[PDB]
C-alpha cells in the first residue's frame, strides 16, 4: 500500500481523496468510476420513472424530471405533449444503465488493479499538474468532446426528428428546426441582455431557432477552443494571473459549476421553452397569471366588464397597466407581466392584453389550460403536499420546477463554498503556508505595528 | 474523622466514566425522569382530553408533531401530582389529564439545578474556576422564566410551552400574535446575544484554525497539537493584525476574548428571560402609542409596524378557537378578519 | 408605506421599504425614473442599497 | 407625533450619565503615573 495512510500521505481519512492528487492512474479510476455513478443514476432513475409512469396523467403530477428531459428532445411525445410511445424512454434508461457497467468496470480497474501512476506507463496519458501545456491539451480534448455534444443536440433538432416546441403554431408539437438562428447579433445579443426582470439574460430564450443556432455557435466555439488549446501553451499574463496545481484547477471548475448551477436554477424556474410546462408543469409566474386569466374568464362569463372593473385599491380588478403602459393582469400578479406562454399570447395585442380579444376570442382550450396551470402552481411541502402551506392534505404534488430549482440552488451554493475553500487552499499551498505559520518566520512579526 | 458521611463521599467522588458526586443524587434521577417522561409521553400519550390534539407516535404523529402537552386550562396551576386530588393515584387518568407535563417540567427544573451543582462540585474537585456553572445560569433563567414563571402569570399551565417540536413552534407564533414578542427589546437583546454568540463561535474557531502555527508535516493539522504543550497553538499576533486591517478592531487579549465569549450569549438569554417574565403578566411591548394615535387619525399612514399588527390580529382570530378550546370560541365566517380574496 | 423617521417612524418601526411590486424584478436604478420624486415613490432606495450591499 | 414628552429627557439622561461615569473613570486612569 503506497500513500494510503496519514503518516505517509499527510492527509487524514476524511481528506482521503487528496492522497490521489499525484496518483494519476488511481485518480483516473476515481473519475471514470464516478462518471459510472452519474450514468448509473441517469439509467436507473429513468427506468424507475417509466415503471412508475402513468401515460394519461400529466408528467408533472408523477414526480418526473428525466422523462421530461427526454420528452423535451422530441422522443415519445406528440401534439400537446401527449405520450405516444414510452419505448424511447426505456431505451435511454437501459442504454445508460448498461454504459454504467462499462464505466464502473474501467473505473474500478484503474482504482485498485491498474497502474497507480501513468507517467512511467505512458507519456500521453501521464500528466504533471504543473505541466501547463499538457493541461491545456487535455482541456482541449474535452472541449472538442463538449462541442461534439452540442452538435449532437443540433443533429437531433435538424435531422433526426426535431425537438418539442411548446410554441408550435396551432399548438405544441415535435417540430423539425430547418432555420436555426445563425446571426451572431441575436445569439450573443442574448448574452448581453440584462438578467433583471423583463430581460432575463440567457434564460429568456423563447424559440427553438435560437436554441439550435446557439448550440451550433457553441459547438464550433468549443471545438475551435479545444484545437486552440492543444496547439498552444498559456500566454505570459495567464501564467502570471493563475495558480498552476490540481487543487487550483479543481477550484476553478467548482466555481464554474457553481455559476452554472445557479443559471440552471433560474432556467428551470422561469423558462417554459426548453422546460415546457406540459412536461414540467407551469412556472410560478405562469400560474399566477393563470389564476388571473381564470377568474377574468369566470367573471366575464357571469357578465362582468373586466376592462372597466375597478378593484378595491383603485387598480383594475382584472386589468391594469405595467409601469410602461402595457395592459396586464392586475392584483399581485402584476409582478409577472413579463410572463410569456403559448396559451396567453393569442390574447396579446400590440399594447399588451387586448380587451376585444379577451371579450370575444378566448377559446375553451385557453380556459382549460389556465385552470390546469393555476391549480398546478409550483407550490408544495417537503413531504409533497400540493398547494399553499396552509392547504389540507389531499393532493400529492410538488412541481418538478421546485424540485429542480431547489436542488440546484443547494448544490450550486455548496459548490461555491467548495470553490472558496479550494481556491484559498490552492493559494495557501502554492505559497507554502496551507499547514500554518512558521513560528521562527512569522510574517506579521516582521511587519511594522499598525499604530 | 472517618465516619459514614466521608466514606460515602469517597465513593460518590470516585473517578469513574460517568462522574456521580453529591449533585448526582439530585441530577441523575431527575434528568432520567424528565427525559424518560418526555419519550414515554411522545411515544404513547395523548393530548385529546387536554387540547383536542394527538401528540404521540401511537396516534400517528411523527417526531415533529409529537408532544407532551400542557394540562387543560381548567387545571389551573395544579402540581398535578400522581397522588394529587386530580388524578388520585390513577396513572392512566393522570396521563390523560396532562400529569406528564408538570412531571417533566418539575423534574426537569430540579434536574437543571442538579446539573449546575454538578458543574460546581466537579469544578471544585478538579480545582478550576467555576465559570461554566455561572454561564449555565442563563439556560436556567430561560427554562424557569418560560416554562414556569410565564404560565404562572397566565391562567394556567395550559399556556406554557408544550414539550414537542411543532408545539414549540406554536408557542412561538402565539407569542407573535398575542405578545408581538419580536417588538420587545428584551427579546431583541436575546437575539443579539444568540446571533452574536454564534458569530463569535464561528469567527473564533475560524480565526484559530486559520492562524495555526505549522507544528507538523501533515497537511491535516490536527495531529500537530499536543495537549500538554506549553506554546499557543495559533498566532494571536497575526489574527489581531488580520482583523485590525479587515474589520478595524481586534482582540489583543485572549482572556478578554474568552470572557466576552461567555458574556455575550449568557447576557442575551438573561435579557430574554426578563422579557418573558414581563409577558407572564401580559406586560408587553405591543404598541407604539404615537403610532396608534397617528394611524387612528390618518388612514394613509402605514408602517411595517401597523402591517405586523394586522398579521397579529389575524393570528389571534384564526388560531384562537382551536388553540384555546376551553374558551368555547365561535367565530362566524363573517367576523373573521380577512383581506381581499384570501 | 412610510419607512423614514421624519415621516413618523422610530428606530424599531423604521425601514427602507422594498421596491414596488409593479417593478417586480425590473432593474430600477435612479435614471430609469422620470424624477427623484417618482424614484422615491416606487422604492428605488431599496434596490440601490441592497445591490450595493450585496456587492460590497 | 404624540410621543411621550419625557422620552427626550429619559433618553438623554440614560445616555449621558453612564457615559459620563465611564469618561470620568477613563480620564482619571490615563493621568495616573506610567
Amino acid at each position: 500500500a503506497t500513500n494510503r495512510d496519514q503518516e505517509s500521505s499527510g492527509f487524514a481519512w476524511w481528506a482521503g481523496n487528496a492522497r490521489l492528487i499525484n496518483l494519476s492512474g488511481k485518480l483516473l479510476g476515481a473519475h471514470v468510476a464516478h462518471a459510472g455513478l452519474i450514468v448509473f443514476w441517469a439509467g436507473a432513475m429513468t427506468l424507475f420513472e417509466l415503471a412508475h409512469f402513468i401515460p394519461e396523467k400529466p408528467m408533472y403530477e408523477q414526480g418526473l424530471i428525466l422523462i421530461p428531459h427526454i420528452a423535451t428532445l422530441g422522443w415519445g411525445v406528440g401534439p400537446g405533449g401527449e405520450v405516444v410511445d414510452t419505448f424511447p424512454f426505456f431505451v435511454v434508461g437501459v442504454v445508460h444503465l448498461i454504459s454504467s457497467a462499462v464505466l464502473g468496470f474501467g473505473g474500478v480497474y484503474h482504482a485498485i488493479r491498474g497502474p497507480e501512476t501513468l507517467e512511467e506507463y505512458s507519456s500521453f496519458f501521464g500528466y504533471d499538474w504543473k505541466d501547463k501545456n499538457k493541461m491545456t491539451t487535455i482541456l482541449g480534448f474535452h472541449l472538442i468532446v463538449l462541442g461534439i455534444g452540442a452538435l449532437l443536440l443540433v443533429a437531433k433538432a435538424m435531422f433526426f426528428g426535431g425537438l418539442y416546441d411548446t410554441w408550435a403554431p396551432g399548438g405544441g408539437d415535435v417540430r423539425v428546426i430547418t432555420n436555426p438562428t445563425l446571426d451572431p447579433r441575436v445569439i450573443f445579443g442574448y448574452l448581453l441582455k440584462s438578467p433583471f426582470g423583463g430581460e432575463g439574460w440567457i434564460v429568456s430564450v423563447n424559440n427553438l431557432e435560437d436554441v439550435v443556432g446557439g448550440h451550433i455557435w457553441i459547438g464550433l466555439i468549443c471545438i475551435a477552443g479545444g484545437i486552440w488549446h492543444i496547439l498552444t501553451t498559456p500566454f505570459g499574463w495567464a501564467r502570471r494571473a493563475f495558480i498552476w496545481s490540481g487543487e487550483a484547477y479543481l477550484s476553478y471548475s467548482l466555481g464554474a459549476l457553481s455559476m452554472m448551477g445557479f443559471i440552471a436554477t433560474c432556467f428551470v424556474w422561469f423558462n417554459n421553452t426548453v422546460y415546457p410546462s406540459e412536461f414540467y408543469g407551469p412556472t410560478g409566474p405562469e400560474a399566477s397569471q393563470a389564476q388571473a386569466m381564470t377568474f377574468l374568464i369566470r367573471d366575464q362569463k357571469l357578465g362582468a366588464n373586466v376592462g372597466s372593473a375597478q378593484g378595491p385599491t383603485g387598480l383594475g380588478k382584472y386589468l391594469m397597466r405595467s409601469p410602461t403602459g402595457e395592459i396586464i393582469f392586475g392584483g399581485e400578479t402584476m409582478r409577472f407581466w413579463d410572463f410569456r406562454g403559448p396559451w396567453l399570447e393569442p390574447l396579446r395585442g400590440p399594447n399588451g392584453l387586448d380587451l376585444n380579444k379577451i371579450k370575444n376570442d378566448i377559446q375553451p382550450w385557453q380556459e382549460r389550460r389556465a385552470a390546469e396551470y393555476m391549480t398546478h402552481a409550483p407550490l408544495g411541502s417537503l413531504n409533497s403536499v400540493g398547494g399553499v402551506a396552509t392547504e389540507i392534505n389531499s393532493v400529492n404534488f410538488v412541481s418538478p420546477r421546485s424540485w429542480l430549482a431547489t436542488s440546484h440552488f443547494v448544490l450550486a451554493f455548496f459548490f461555491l463554498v467548495g470553490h472558496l475553500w479550494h481556491a484559498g487552499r490552492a493559494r495557501a499551498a502554492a505559497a507554502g503556508f496551507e499547514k500554518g505559520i512558521d513560528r521562527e518566520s512569522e510574517p506579521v512579526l516582521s511587519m511594522p505595528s499598525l499604530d | 474523622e472517618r465516619g459514614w458521611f466521608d466514606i460515602l463521599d469517597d465513593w460518590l467522588k470516585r473517578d469513574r466514566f460517568v462522574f456521580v458526586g453529591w449533585s448526582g443524587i439530585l441530577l441523575f434521577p431527575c434528568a432520567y425522569l424528565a427525559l424518560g417522561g418526555w419519550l414515554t409521553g411522545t411515544t404513547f400519550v395523548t393530548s385529546w382530553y387536554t387540547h383536542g390534539l394527538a401528540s404521540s407516535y401511537l396516534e400517528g404523529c411523527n417526531f415533529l408533531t409529537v408532544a407532551v402537552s400542557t394540562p387543560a386550562n381548567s387545571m389551573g396551576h395544579s402540581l398535578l401530582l400522581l397522588w394529587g386530588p386530580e388524578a388520585q393515584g390513577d396513572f392512566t387518568r393522570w396521563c390523560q389529564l396532562g400529569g406528564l407535563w408538570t412531571f417533566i417540567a418539575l423534574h426537569g427544573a430540579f434536574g437543571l439545578i442538579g446539573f449546575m451543582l454538578r458543574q460546581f462540585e466537579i469544578a471544585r474537585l478538579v480545582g478550576v474556576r467555576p465559570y461554566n456553572a455561572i454561564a449555565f445560569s442563563a439556560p436556567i433563567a430561560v427554562f424557569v422564566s418560560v416554562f414556569l414563571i410565564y404560565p404562572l402569570g397566565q391562567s394556567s399551565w395550559f399556556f406554557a410551552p408544550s414539550f414537542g417540536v411543532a408545539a414549540i413552534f406554536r408557542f412561538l407564533l402565539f407569542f407573535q400574535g398575542f405578545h408581538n414578542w419580536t417588538l420587545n427589546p428584551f427579546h431583541m437583546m436575546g437575539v443579539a446575544g444568540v446571533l452574536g454568540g454564534a458569530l463569535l463561535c464561528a469567527i473564533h474557531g475560524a480565526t484559530v484554525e486559520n492562524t495555526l502555527f505549522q507544528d507538523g508535516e501533515g497537511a491535516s493539522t490536527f495531529r500537530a497539537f499536543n495537549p500538554t504543550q506549553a506554546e499557543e497553538t495559533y498566532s494571536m499576533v497575526t489574527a489581531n493584525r488580520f482583523w485590525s486591517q479587515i474589520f478595524g478592531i481586534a482582540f489583543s487579549n485572549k482572556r478578554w476574548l474568552h470572557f466576552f465569549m461567555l458574556f455575550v450569549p449568557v447576557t442575551g438569554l438573561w435579557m430574554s428571560a426578563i422579557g418573558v417574565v414581563g409577558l407572564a403578566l401580559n406586560l408587553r411591548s405591543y404598541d407604539f402609542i404615537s403610532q396608534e394615535i397617528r394611524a387612528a387619525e390618518d388612514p394613509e399612514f402605514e408602517t411595517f409596524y401597523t402591517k405586523n399588527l394586522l398579521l397579529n390580529e389575524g393570528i389571534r382570530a384564526w388560531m384562537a378557537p382551536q388553540d384555546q378550546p376551553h374558551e368555547n370560541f365561535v367565530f362566524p365566517e363573517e367576523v373573521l378578519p380577512r383581506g381581499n380574496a384570501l | 408605506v412610510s419607512g423614514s423617521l421624519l415621516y413618523g417612524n422610530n428606530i424599531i418601526t423604521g425601514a427602507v421599504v422594498p421596491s414596488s411590486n409593479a417593478i417586480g424584478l425590473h432593474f430600477y436604478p435612479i435614471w430609469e425614473a422620470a424624477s427623484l420624486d417618482e424614484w422615491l415613490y416606487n422604492g428605488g432606495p431599496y434596490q440601490l442599497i441592497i445591490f450595493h450591499f450585496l456587492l460590497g | 407625533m404624540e410621543v411621550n414628552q419625557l422620552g427626550l429627557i429619559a433618553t438623554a439622561l440614560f445616555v449621558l450619565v453612564p457615559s459620563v461615569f465611564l469618561i470620568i473613570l477613563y480620564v482619571q486612569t490615563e493621568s495616573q503615573q506610567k
Partner: peptide, 30 residues
C-alpha cells in the same frame, strides 16, 4: 425631537467607531 434624538444617538455611535478604531490604545508585545 424624537428624530433628533435618534439621529444624534446614531451619530454618537459612528463617532465612537471612529475613535475606537483610529484612536484605540495600541496592542503591544511585551
Amino acid at each position: 425631537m424624537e428624530t433628533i434624538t435618534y439621529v444624534f444617538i446614531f451619530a454618537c455611535i459612528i463617532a465612537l467607531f471612529f475613535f475606537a478604531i483610529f484612536f484605540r490604545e495600541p496592542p503591544r508585545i511585551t
